[PDB]
């Protein structure tokens, strides 16, 4: 997360961590959607150009965390994945259309003060909250600044970061890229005239993009950190996976496979 801040203890109880066994490393972010289902981005699991095609036994899901590197003994909970369900029409060749994957846990997770799920939007919450101008929230243990130039210094958070971003108009999103954008995505970020900064970045992928409902003070996940060009760069926004639009798929697999 670029130009964000440290998260508060228990502030994002749905944030999940994809941690690879060998080598041992943070793979991406994710989110508790229930006690046995986690929502992540297809590309964390499947991306040929970089030689990725992880299997269920290839990794672990660690929930309850705050610190990035610390094994927080009686706070976090590491669970094994049973099966992984990625979207059938996912596109890694061209634009990352339908960057969505669901993962099923072997055993249900025990909710605590630090572990709790996020709601999934619905037609009316989507309609009344997904508006250009409205601010959302992104969490992740990803990079502190674009992996580039003469970045002298750390570049890795020690504790979970967080940044509040505004939703941008579709016309303005499509025009900042030469990349084909689809309705299964949407961008967020300060427009140039704002002269402000903040963004997700490498390592924040599959992480939730949330919003608080003013009509039931409840949190709904509206997007999944999907892609970008650079991080925190001028006149460029970050694209997220449109969760509400892929919901039809989300329901289909869950109510059929657990």
């Amino acid at each position: 997360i670029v130009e964000g801040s440290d998260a508060e203890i228990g502030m994002s109880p749905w944030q999940v961590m994809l941690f690879r066994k060998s080598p041992q490393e943070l793979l991406c972010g994710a989110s508790l959607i229930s006690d046995r289902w986690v929502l992540t981005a297809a590309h964390c699991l499947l991306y040929p150009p970089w030689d990725k095609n992880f299997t269920e036994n290839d990794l672990l899901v660690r929930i309850g965390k705050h610190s990035r590197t610390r094994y927080e003994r009686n706070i976090e909970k590491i669970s094994m994945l049973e099966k992984i369900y990625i979207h059938p029409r996912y596109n890694w060749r061209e634009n990352l259309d339908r960057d969505i994957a669901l993962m099923k846990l072997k055993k249900p997770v025990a909710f605590s003060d630090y572990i709790h799920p996020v709601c999934l939007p619905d037609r009316e919450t989507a309609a009344s909250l997904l508006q250009a101008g409205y601010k959302g929230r992104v969490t992740g243990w990803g990079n502190l600044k674009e992996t580039w130039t003469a970045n002298v210094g750390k570049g890795q958070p020690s504790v979970l970061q967080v940044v509040n971003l505004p939703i941008v108009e579709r016309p303005v999103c499509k025009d900042s890229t030469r990349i084909r954008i689809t309705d299964n995505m949407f961008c967020a970020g300060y427009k140039p005239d704002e002269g402000k900064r903040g963004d997700a970045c490498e390592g924040d992928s599959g992480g939730p993009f949330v919003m608080k409902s003013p009509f039931n003070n409840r949190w709904y996940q509206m997007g999944i950190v999907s892609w970008g060009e650079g991080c925190d760069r001028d006149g460029k926004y970050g694209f997220y996976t449109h969760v509400f639009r892929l919901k039809k798929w989300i329901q289909k697999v869950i109510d059929q496979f657990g």
Binding site: Q24, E25, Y71, M80
Partner: peptide, 9 residues
């Protein structure tokens, strides 16, 4: 970089 987790996990 990360702290070793239990062998049984």
């Amino acid at each position: 970089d990360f702290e070793e987790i239990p062998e049984e996990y």
